[PDB]
Write an enzyme that holds these catalytic residues in place. Sequence first.
Site, PDB file in Angstrom:
ATOM      1  CG  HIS A  41      -0.502   0.471   2.463  1.00 30.12           C
ATOM      2  ND1 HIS A  41      -0.167  -0.394   3.485  1.00 30.12           N
ATOM      3  CD2 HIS A  41      -0.292   1.723   2.944  1.00 30.12           C
ATOM      4  CE1 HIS A  41       0.264   0.304   4.523  1.00 30.12           C
ATOM      5  NE2 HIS A  41       0.189   1.592   4.223  1.00 30.12           N
ATOM      6  CG  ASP A  92      -0.099  -3.747   2.734  1.00 31.92           C
ATOM      7  OD1 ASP A  92       0.359  -3.292   1.665  1.00 31.92           O
ATOM      8  OD2 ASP A  92      -0.312  -3.035   3.750  1.00 31.92           O
ATOM      9  CB  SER A 187       2.761   1.870   6.169  1.00 32.39           C
ATOM     10  OG  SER A 187       1.565   2.196   6.851  1.00 32.39           O
ATOM     11  N   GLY A 188       5.241  -0.266   6.069  1.00 26.38           N
ATOM     12  CA  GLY A 188       6.341  -0.739   5.252  1.00 26.38           C
ATOM     13  C   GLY A 188       7.601  -1.051   6.044  1.00 26.38           C
TER      14      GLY A 188
END
Length: 235
Positions: A41, A92, A187-188
Amino acid sequence: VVGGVNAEKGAWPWMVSLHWRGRHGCGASLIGRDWLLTAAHCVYGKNTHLQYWSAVLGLHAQSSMNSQEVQIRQVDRIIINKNYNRRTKEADIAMMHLQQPVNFTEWVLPVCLASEDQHFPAGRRCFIAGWGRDAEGGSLPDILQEAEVPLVDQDECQRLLPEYTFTSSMLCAGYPEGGVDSCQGDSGGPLMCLEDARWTLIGVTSFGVGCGRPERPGAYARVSAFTSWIAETRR
């Protein structure tokens, strides 16, 4: 990251800040000389004019992008897992190719990846890192944050996050009372566990209901579920 503390310089040498059009927008993990692992994402919809990306490695403070501890690379290729479903949050996970390899230094070094039946049971204390929000409603820290959070059993993850279909390709971590979590901007980035004295990447920061809330543990793409895809996409 909420409920954490300043990481020291070189604490997490696989930690990378993904800049896009000049700004940190997500984290990622260095897994080799040429490849990054991140959340899908983070890169979805940004797989076009790749020159907008800059992978910033060996970074401590965002205001010190310029230190000779810092290595920065263009991103050449983005490979989103084919099972990614942005609606359901399944798979994801994505990989990014560095346009030129990094040099392994004190400040930059890849992480080992969790294997198939390596065991990481609920209650195990693991670490998250990132430049994401200080709290849901907090500010963005200049200096990289780290925090220790415990893994939560799969069944509990799903009871606690009924808004999602929680799969075997996910893990979740956090405290019942809350206070320690990855937040927007993380995120990530990595969820890493010390295993037989070796740092190993277990999860990729993926999604959550708010951050640091009571009984709302953050959720992570489970690295061990993507072993073969990761292996094949290499180089």
